[PDB]
Amino acid sequence: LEATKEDNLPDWYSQVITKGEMIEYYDVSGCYILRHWSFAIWKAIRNWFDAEITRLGVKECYFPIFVSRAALERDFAPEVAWVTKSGDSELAEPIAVRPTSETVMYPAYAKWIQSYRDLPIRLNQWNNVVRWEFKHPQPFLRTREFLWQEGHTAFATQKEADEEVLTILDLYAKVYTDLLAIPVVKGRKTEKEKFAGGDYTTTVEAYISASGRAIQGATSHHLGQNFSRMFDIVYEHPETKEKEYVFQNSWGITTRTIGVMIMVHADNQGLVLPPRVACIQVVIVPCGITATTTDDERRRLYESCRELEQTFVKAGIRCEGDYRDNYSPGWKYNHWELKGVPVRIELGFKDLQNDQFVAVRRDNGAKQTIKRAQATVEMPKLLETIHTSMYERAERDLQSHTKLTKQWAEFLQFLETKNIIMAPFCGEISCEDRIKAESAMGAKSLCIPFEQPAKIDPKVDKCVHPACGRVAKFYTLFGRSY
Amino acid sequence: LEATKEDNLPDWYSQVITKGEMIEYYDVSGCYILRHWSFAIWKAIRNWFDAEITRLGVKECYFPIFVSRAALERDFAPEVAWVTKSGDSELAEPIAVRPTSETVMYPAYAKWIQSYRDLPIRLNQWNNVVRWEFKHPQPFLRTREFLWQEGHTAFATQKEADEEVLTILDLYAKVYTDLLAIPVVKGRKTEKEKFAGGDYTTTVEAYISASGRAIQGATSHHLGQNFSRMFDIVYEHPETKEKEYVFQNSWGITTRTIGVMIMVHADNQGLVLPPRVACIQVVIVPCGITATTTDDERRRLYESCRELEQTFVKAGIRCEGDYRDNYSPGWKYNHWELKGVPVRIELGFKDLQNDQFVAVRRDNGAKQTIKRAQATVEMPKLLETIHTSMYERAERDLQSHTKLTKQWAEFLQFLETKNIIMAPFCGEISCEDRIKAESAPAMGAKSLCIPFEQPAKIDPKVDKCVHPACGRVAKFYTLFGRSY
Ligand SMILES: Nc1ncnc2c1ncn2[C@@H]1O[C@H](COP(=O)(O)OP(=O)(O)NP(=O)(O)O)[C@@H](O)[C@H]1O
Ligand SMILES: Nc1ncnc2c1ncn2[C@@H]1O[C@H](COP(=O)(O)OP(=O)(O)NP(=O)(O)O)[C@@H](O)[C@H]1O
Ligand SMILES: O=C(C[C@H]1NCCC[C@@H]1O)Cn1cnc2cc(Br)c(Cl)cc2c1=O
Ligand SMILES: O=C(C[C@H]1NCCC[C@@H]1O)Cn1cnc2cc(Br)c(Cl)cc2c1=O
Ligand SMILES: [Mg+2]
Ligand SMILES: [Mg+2]
């Protein structure tokens, strides 16, 4: 590993994603070959979330990657990738590679709702979407093609919609903290940062101390009746028949997760995978095989290592051994340290003589010896222990970069000191622009958190800036972002 | 269903796939909205095959949907979709939507095999691909975007490659016979119909009698060293430091599976889904209505039906009840019969009094009464019974359309009356072209495959090719017929 995380972050990240065997750079700018290592992490995330939402009643479909011009046109216009040509023959009308599927799914929804009896609609797509991002692309954070799931739901009454938005958001937050061991702040986005066609938007924000910047981890919007008016998704009331518009929601999460994991956990020696998503959770690395190693002893070692690995598998542990005779044990140590496998097993001849083995943690590198009887009990403890110690390590990190203040001056102080700031705010868009302006790379709104620091005292509290709406409507989290 | 399968096949196919709620037609020609129902079918096939191939050891990755012009340019040119514009701004280089990934994965392979020690590389991706086909598209058989799985593999020795080719081909055929209940002919593709960049091509062909045509259900190719040579996928031989090229396969299967399912099994009342991929295997339909609704009895009926479906799901059976108030039991009957649910459950107040229910089969409409204790046993047996009755009927159909001959004249007779033929063949492509011509959306006859189960030795003492003008090698038997 060539670069360090603290000095020269972009090339630390590059080094990690390549020497960790998750990326291969690709000759269409801003898209990246996904290797087995990364893709398994995405599979773990995808599988948990789909089990969750299929338990809830969301069904799965798939709309085509292509969107007609006419479909799309009824403004992110500069972000649309256009097929214009089939080979050498130029196309009558161009077709667009999808960025999202509202334009295609909501007309379908108008067609599928023939009566009140057809509601609710709860569909989800696991697909890939292409946005010709103008902002600097980063290998997992912002790729021009990315894989995600997008769910679009239609409801009779607004209660169902509000409840599902929050349900999905709790799911998203659990993906972050329970799968990837990352702390996140749940909140509402301001009127400036909400999804334009929506009503309100929930988010799950995370903070990179390295970058000093925060990043949106997923979104769950409540669309209200905005789109159902746009696309005329209506039904007649069963009693007192009158044209009623349905209530909608949409939500999404992407491979950005992997990037956020990297940024939060990887150290200066490679990746550090959260145990619950790591492809290989335990790797056994046989050692002690000197020059004078009688081939019977090398076979005996290999036999015991394979027996240990499979008794791990039977106890539900993703464990593999590394028995390649072309590499030294120390080489194997480094290799798997870059791949960030949570626990390495060291099984030498002396450990064999004692019916034990030594486990080494990828975070903090602590060694600890374990007898082979307790293998199926200690090892899962250790995996959970690692998860917690990762999450807490990051959570304390977040808590040390969040400062609360009611003054602009020390707001700017904090912002320059590489941390994000909780301050009272009016919410007004003009003022939010003024804050970002006078902070320059300037300070953006992250979300209005669900957990407020204090109740706002209306006779006292004021906004964090000079003109505003004056009266503080709530506390908002602000900071530099991705 | 307005139209019949027998008269007006295309319009029947449209009616079943729409009123069965799997397709939604789409305003970009040759793409089709996959509704929840069909996609559940695809999901089952995918999970089965993925369990299988990752158990064998194939790993999964994901390359971008976009291909550099240069990558791709290093025949099918009119089928490539080109992104040229990002909104307003035209792009530096144009990019192509992937049509397959050899052009892109094999350079990575060349970068990834640094030694003999890195071998074998056995990768799979589940992804979507686009081809602007020059043929009329039909909703699952040939779509302009379609989803698939492509597996690409590289091996030190040719033996490993041959073996995986055949293993994978067996897995494809199992998807067809164990999952979709369709009988399929394993074979080798002729020199004319094999994949051009390959060595040989295996296939699994299936026959739809409605259209009287065969269709390729999947492919497993042996690329040998042709692609390893193009892209210089090499390693240094261990004993002798000398450049050795790897041996490769690639194989793939697409959403066409669902189409052949539809074509082979659905009747003139809608779908008939095979039990092992059916999204709902059993639908429960109560039977008390109108004025006779002492609501206590309606709640008693609903609560016992939820108990039966719950005890069915816990025994791993995909069962849901249909309890909507709006509709009548006869409507729900017709609805789910369009959806091809293998067995419909009818549970009225009388069966309630007798601790029973009656199950009706979607394939025959045959009824059979079942007491509620034995439900946990009788239902899965019925699911197996229904499966094999589907496969067996389809196999009797295939066998009654497979005919064998050595005289060209009766080859043409058999083909003209809508069935497929197995005849002695030389293997030559010019001769195959003459065959296809002399039979005349291809109205001529194609080579389907050289079957693995040959009937009779094609012994050269006297055996000659079935065409009058061929160089009568009589190398083997080939299966011919109109195909998709
Ligand atoms: N290019 C991308 N690569 C990966 N994940 C992305 C990308 N763009 C957006 N996401 C994530 O996808 C979720 C839903 O997308 P969306 O809300 O449409 O993002 P967005 O408005 O474009 N955010 P931004 O990148 O700041 O413009 C967000 O919560 C992001 O975390
Ligand atoms: N447009 C399509 N839609 C769905 N399945 C397809 C399509 N084209 C090919 N297939 C299937 O996908 C598998 C792999 O594709 P491929 O090897 O390219 O077939 P192919 O050479 O294109 N045959 P052809 O349909 O005549 O062009 C084959 O087994 C086909 O049955
Ligand atoms: O895509 C969204 C909002 C939501 N869509 C459903 C899944 C979750 C997601 O947050 C916002 N957005 C973002 N980027 C876009 C890029 C283009 Br190009 C287009 Cl046309 C449209 C959009 C667009 O609407
Ligand atoms: O796609 C293939 C061969 C194999 N690729 C890997 C998955 C299994 C599959 O049988 C054949 N084929 C078919 N159609 C194509 C269309 C275009 Br456009 C291109 Cl460039 C290339 C191709 C092309 O190579
Ligand atoms: Mg964006
Ligand atoms: Mg083709």
Ligand SMILES: [Zn+2]
């Ligand atoms: Zn203000």
Ligand SMILES: [Zn+2]
């Ligand atoms: Zn011949």
